[PDB]
Design a protein around this nucleic acid. Sequence first.
RNA 1: ACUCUGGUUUCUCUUCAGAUCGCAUAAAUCUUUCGCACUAAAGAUUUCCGUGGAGAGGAACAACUCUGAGU
Lengths: 56, 156, 79, 101
Amino acid sequence: VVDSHVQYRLGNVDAFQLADGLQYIFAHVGQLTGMYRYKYKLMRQIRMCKDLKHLI
Amino acid sequence: KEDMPPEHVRKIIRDHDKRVYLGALKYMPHAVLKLLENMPMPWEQIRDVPVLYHITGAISFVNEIPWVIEPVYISQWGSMWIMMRREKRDRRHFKRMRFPPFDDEEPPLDYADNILDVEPLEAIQLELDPEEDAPVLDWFYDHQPLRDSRKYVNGS
Amino acid sequence: SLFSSGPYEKDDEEADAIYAALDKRMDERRKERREQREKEEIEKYRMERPKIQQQFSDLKRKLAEVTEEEWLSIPEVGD
Amino acid sequence: DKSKELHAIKERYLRKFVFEWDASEDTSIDYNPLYKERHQVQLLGRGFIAGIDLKQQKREQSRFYGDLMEKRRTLEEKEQEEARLRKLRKKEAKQRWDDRH
RNA sequence: ACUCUGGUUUCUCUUCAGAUCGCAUAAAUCUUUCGCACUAAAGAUUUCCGUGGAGAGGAACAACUCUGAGU
């Protein structure tokens, strides 16, 4: 998240690109980050995010 | 106590009894949670926050809490919705930024070197027509809209 | 703990005391009710299920009243 | 659907980290026509479901209330609505002209 | 129609709080239940995220609009 924000602050990407990247990060935590293996319950949250994507 | 110049914490974290450091390291998940919950909104370019930092630089919490007025927040996010839809309709070749920003082992960027003097390109603020949005165009896109106005909010 | 031993001095002791005080202050949020419930729960658990050592302590203490001459008199199971 | 219904009558009286849900977990698989095709809300022709594009909702709406207005509105009311629509469409066309590829 | 309290803002401490303490929503543990438990329900405890009420203390600038009382 912080790296996306610093990337926006440098000016490489647009603010729309920043917001879309944040949405992708928060909707693809399992893919971008290996969280589910260490805590199984976390998987539920992941599905929430994907469901929310399907909602939006 | 009183707030100190931001250069002091900058120098401390630049330069770096291990018991104090180790004990400070314990509360790191609070640091993560407070950093993430104070995350800037899409309509903000810079969001200055009060920060409680360890004297040794071992940790730094974002002190404040994201207090937002519910109708103003919902209206701002509705304007964001409109602007996002307009931009996605405009840009056929929208390019998502690299999923893993920066190198896997790229040293972290120094804020005082390449972020401090760079001004933001723009925000996602929706353009407000002065004839209809007259009462709100003055503060619709502030970090905290009416924080300094005594009439509309209780206070600081 | 990975830091069980190391450069421990008066400043380290002060830091540990401060952080322990902070932890105690954090636990003060529900300390009274939590400790009351813990005491009640452990009391009822011990009352309901007694440890086998507790059950045999009565016979253990009643077993103290025995002469050392009788200990040599304990037979085998050959009869 | 009728076999689904009669069946319904009878029935009542007689690891792996899965990121995406399975389609068998779906509900709303109805047999009654009253429940499959549910008559959507037409909020007097002036209310719209949140999120969806307003123009799409206007295009795909039932147009019942438009007929009701064109039948009930007087001539002066028709002129008023026509003028308002003219101005709004002028503003929309100006916005579209500004927003061009 | 003339007098007199109760001021507001902010910081901190203490205590109560079953109030949607929160128009939001997590984690852990134990028991129970049928499967054979991220992809599962029930019951209970606890910890975090942060509130409301009351009181006390600190300091900031306002002192009679209002609430009234004394007329």
